[PDB]
Each structure stands twice: as C-alpha cells, then as structure tokens.
Amino acid sequence: YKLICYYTSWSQYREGDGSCFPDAIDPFLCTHVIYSFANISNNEIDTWEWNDVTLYDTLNTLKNRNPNLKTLLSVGGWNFGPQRFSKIASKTQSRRTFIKSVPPFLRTHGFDGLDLAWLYPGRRDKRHLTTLVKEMKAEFIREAQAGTEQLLLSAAVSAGKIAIDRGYDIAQISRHLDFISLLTYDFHGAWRQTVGHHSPLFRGQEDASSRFSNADYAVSYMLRLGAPANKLVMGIPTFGKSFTLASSKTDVGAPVSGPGIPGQFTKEKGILAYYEICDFLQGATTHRFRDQQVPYATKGNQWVAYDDQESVKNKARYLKNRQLAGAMVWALDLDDFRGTFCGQNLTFPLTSAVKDVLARA
Template sequence: MNKLLLLTGLVLLLQMQLGSSFKLVCYFTNWAQYYPAPATYMPDNVDPCMCTHLIYAFATMNNNQIAPFEWNDPTLYASFNALKNYNSELKTLLSVGGWNYGTSGFNTMVSSSENRQTFINSVIKFLRQYDFDGLDIDWEYPGDSDRGSPPQTQQQFSVLLQEMHEAFVQEASQSNKPRLLMSAAVSAGKSTIQAGYQIPQLSKYLDLINVMTYDLRGSWEGFTGEDSPLFQGPADQGGYIYFNVDYAMNFWKDNGAAAEKLMVGFPAYGRTFTLSNPANNGLGAPISGAGPAAPYTQEAGFMAYFEICDFLKQDATVVWNSPQAVPYAYKGSQWIGYDNQKSFQIKAEWLMKNNFGGAMVWALPLDDFSGKFCGQGKYPLMNTLKSTLGISFPNCKTPTITVAPNTAQPATAAAPTASGSDGNSGFCVGKGNGLYPNPKNKSGFFNCLNGHTYQESCQTGLVFDSSCNCCNWA
C-alpha cells in the first residue's frame, strides 16, 4: 500500500512539473472594441497567462485571398501577438470566416485547385507577416444546403486541408520555422456534421478541432432551452436528443476524430427568450420571441456572462437544471439559459474524464474580464477552466501596463497603403506599433506598423483623440 501511495505521489508530482496535457483555446473578437465602456475589449485586456491558444476572430477573404476585416486589424494583430512576449508557450491563430461571413466565399475558394492554392499562398504570407502561429477556419458550414454550400464542398474541404497541411510542412522546412498550425471551428449538430465533414480526414490534418457545442437551443426553436446542456434532458424527444455536449463530442470521436484533438466548446454567454406567459417559466416553455438586446453586447436573444450577472442581481430566480448540469434563470417575461462557474467546472471535469483534448471558449470579451460585474474576480469563467484543467505557465509574466480602450467610433479607411506623397513616409521610423495623431490634420492619424507609415483619417465630423487612440467627436 505504501509503495502504491508513493507511486501515485510521484505521478502527481511529475504531472505538476510537466504541466497539464489539456489545452485551453480562447477566441478574441475584433468587434468587442466597439462595446460601450466598461465592456470595451482590446488585445491589451487579454491575460497572456491564461490560455494555451489564442484565436483572433475574424479575418475575411477577397478574391480567394485572406484579408483583414476591421479598419485597425493590423494594429490589433501587433498587440495580440505581442502577448507572446509575456508567455513563450502561447500560440496565436487567425480565424477566417464566421457565421456572418456566410458560405459563398468558401464555396468559391475550394472549388478549384487554382483557387485553393491562391488562398493557401496568401495565408502563409499573411500569417508570417503578422506573426501568427496558425490558421483557424470557421466555415459555417460546408455541405450545408440551408446555408448555401453545395454537397461537393464536404469533400473539397478535406482536399483544402490536405493541400494546406502539405504546403505548411514544406514552408516550415524551407523557412526553418515551426510549422504553422491548423484548426477549424466545426458544428455540433449531427445532421450538419454528417453533411459537412469527412471526420477522419479532418482529424488527420487539423491540430485542433474546435466543436461549437453551444447555441444548441435558442429563440429560433420557439420554446425555452439551454444554450449548452451537458446531457440530454428528460423531456428531449426526436432530434433534440442529439443536441447536447455529451452526444456531440462522442459523435465526433466515434466517427473517426482523435479525442486529443477535440476541443469542447464552452460559451461565456447565454441565450435569452421572452416568455409567452410569465407564469409558465420552465424548460420548454412557449415564447413570443428572443429576449431584448442587452446594454453592452446589443444583440437580441444573447447575453454575455457579465451581463447575466447584472440580470441575476435584479431579483431573478435561478434554477439549477441538474439532469443537464447547467442553470437557467427568469424574471417576469425574461428567461435565459446559460453557463456559470459550477457548470464550467462540471463540464471541464467531464472532458478530462473522457480524455478529450481540452476546452475552447467563445469568447474572452464575454467573461467578466474586469471583475466589475459579477463579484467573482477577473475572468471568473476562464479561471474556473484554467484551474480545473490544471493549466499553468510558471514562466509567464502578466503585463502591468494597459492601453486606454477605444470607447468611441472607429476611424474609417480603405485598406491602408504606405504614405509618401505628403512627405510623411518616414514618420513611423523608430516608433512603436500603434496610432499617432497627425499634427497637421486634427482628423488624421498615422498607423505605425513595423516601422512602416500608413496615413488614415476619421469619419467626417470626427477628430483623432489621443486619450483613447480613437476617433471622437470634436
């Protein structure tokens, strides 16, 4: 018995020294810079000592080539990837696509060898230029006719991943740099998975398979339900028995995905509903529509975790849904299905027990990153995952200086081109990456990136405000 205890102790000690084998994959969203203060979120708000992988969402595509989406993406890329200066183990990826991007761009890109090669070449150049460690593809969804993807895109997606992997291996050999990583955000719905993915092929070429095990219920169903239930509910019937984390993750694994590559999706938000009858407020209750837009995220039917904390403070009734291991809450006609620290811990313990690769979180700006809303400290959901999964970075140094957030309207500019016609081409030489006021034009500013000067200007009626590095009313 003493030998067994000693051996167990040595194993635990070794695990502590080697660190956790689980991954914590975290999405950053470039539109959170427009949330009203104090919810405004920038790369400088990211704790570099929290996640193993950070994914920047979203880039777009133009003419089968990857491209920035937001006006200031190149500046944010620099701040985002500078987080690796604090944590040498951190990996950063750039995600292309997203729900709002749709499918037509992906359909065209994968449709021919020439188009795929154009995309892959642009990705390699772009990721190396901006110091990303890999690409994340968020195509929602290949093979999904309801979303506009023809059936052949299922197989074409596999071909893209194979060709991209081969190109990444070749580029790494030629550049003598680590191979660029490949990940994809994929569906958790059984029929969507079957139509969209050749699972063994995806598992062969992807480093991370980020399963979006959330949005499993929403106001589109016509009745209340949990956003990300761990298990099937007692009242679930028909196809609804498939819409839970346990079923979705095991479906991926049982159909050919390597468990260690599968990341379980965790939502730092909830789905909201307006009840048809406030007296009927349980699971499956009829609704009249989505809940109203919350004050910060401003999207009907959606509420960030920090906004949920405010809702709960208003004498809302909280119910623990034990069969599905998640809570829900209601007040008057408003109902929300969501996750909290307790459900995050239970799911994390479940994924560890089932030997999945780790957790993926959508998204960092939705947690109470400042600690001002929930009274649970900074990043309560993220820190629950980090501690449960046993993730630590002994050599990581948390930055002590943060940049003032962008609290006003963004500047508008076309894709920046290096200035020179006005004699300011050398403005950024010797300066750090970032935005600087143009002393000759109150509405203008310079965007400095790696010593290159890009001249941009604010919308009509706005001036550049150095206090927030943003365009503001005069």
C-alpha cells in the same frame, strides 16, 4: 491540456467598460488565443477591421510576457457567407491562391497558425473541405522547410449531428488538423417557439426527440466517426441566450415570442455576455436543470439560458474524464474580463474556473 480562447474583433466598439482590446487578455490564462475574423479578398486572406493590423500587433505582444503562448488567426465566421467559402474551395485555382497567400500573411503579423471557421459546409462542399484542409496542411509542411516552426492548422466544427453528417469527413480532416474545436453551445435558439438550453452537457431523461442535442452525444459521435480524442477540444460558452416569454410559464416547454431584449453593452437581441448576466441575476429567479447540468434564470418576461462557474467546471471535468485534448472558450470578451461585474474582483471568472479544473487531472 489545451485552453483555446477566441477574441472577437468587433468587441472593441462596445460602449464603456464593455469595450475590449487584446490588451486586456491575461497572457497566462489560455494556451492558445485565436483572433476572430480575417476576411478573404481577391482570393487571399486579408484583414477585416480598419485597425486589425494594430490589434494583431497588440495581441502578439502578449507573447513577450508568455513565450509559450500561441496565437491563431481565424478565417470565416458568421458574417462571412458560407457560399463565399464554397466558391473559393470548389475551384482548384481560387483554392490554391488562397492557400499560397496564408503563410506569408501569418508570418508578417506574428500568428502561429490558421483557424478555419467555415460555418457550415453543405452536402455539396464536404469533398472540397477535405481538399482545402489537406492542401492547406501540405503547404504548411512545405513552408516549415525554411527553418521556422510549422504553422498550426485548426477548425471550428458544428456539434449538430445532421450538420456533421452533411458537410464533414471527420476521419479524413482529423489526420491533417492539429486540433478541432467542437461548437457544443448551439443546441437551441429562438428558431423554436420554446424555451430551452443551448449548451446542456447531458440529454435530459425528460425529452427524447433531439437526444442528439447535448455535448455528450456530440463528443461520443465524433469519437465514433474517427476523430482522435487527443485532437478534440470541447467548446464552452461564456455567453447566454435570452428569450422573451409569451406567457407567465417559466418551466421546460414554456412558450416563446422571440429573443430577449438586448443587453446594455452587447446590444444584440438573443445574446447576453456573462458580465451582463451577472447584472441580470440581481432580482432574478435562478433554476438549474438537474439532468442537463446547466442553469437558467428569469425576471419579468425574460428567460436566460447560461453557464456559470459550476456548469463550466462540470463540463471541464467531463472533457477530462473522456481524455479530450482540452477546452475551447468562445469569447474572452464575453466573460467578465474586467472582473468588476460579477461580485468577486476576479478577472475572467468563467475561463479561470475552466483553467483551474484543467490544471488538475
């Protein structure tokens, strides 16, 4: 089973214990570590942060302790304009330039592959994505003739039904990609004036409208569109989504006035790291959706949808029963990487729970 873990560049700037460098990653925890967010300049892959080449180097040295560990560099991300991605892939000339620039860059910095994070091609890009993947893969095949191990090619793909139907030719891209990470953790979030969970496993016999907004439906739909199970990786989040309540109501359908207040370390409205949630829970009321199989907590006027060891173990069993290629974890740096906030002196408690179930079949 694969365990694919993202590390984010910007996590180094978090004050105090929140600061996270690749140095803190356990080399034996994951099978693949993906460094998040390379840029594109002058139609060529490029660094993002001022100290990226140093961090690339610190990350890739983990391979000295675990030579089976693979690393990938991810291009794109949220702060990357999808329009930008769109203009690059649309034009054979800018696209071929981008493609030819990738292998040498990957080789120079010690990466084993490229992860595409085009965050949402529209209906007009569907065809250009297919071309980009096809041609990127053909280039990696050619580049291996030089005697070094073929570069891996992956993509992060939306788990939203409409997003899938709109921008992705799954049957076509699946044959060229080594694995596909399903972003099954954005099924709700502040764009609605209600409370709700962003990563439920099952539908929730309760509602019925976006019967499509759960992990299970996303997985079944992808299988149906032609993605082979042995290439699909189910995303599991290590962060939570917070909301500020508009009333004293806390149950399903409770009105909302906006995202929750920022966490002391991640300083981003609407999101809390798992290590911040561990602190939040002290004095909070915990609940669990029986049908969706995920918990939530409340304290004062703050409502948090998150994943704990049990929800994470559950998702992992589920991907096991469906014979998927493995799990993807978004943000090693949002998990308790120091292992000093969540009671037990256990480093990476969410990710480890996942690894433990996987070590099982």
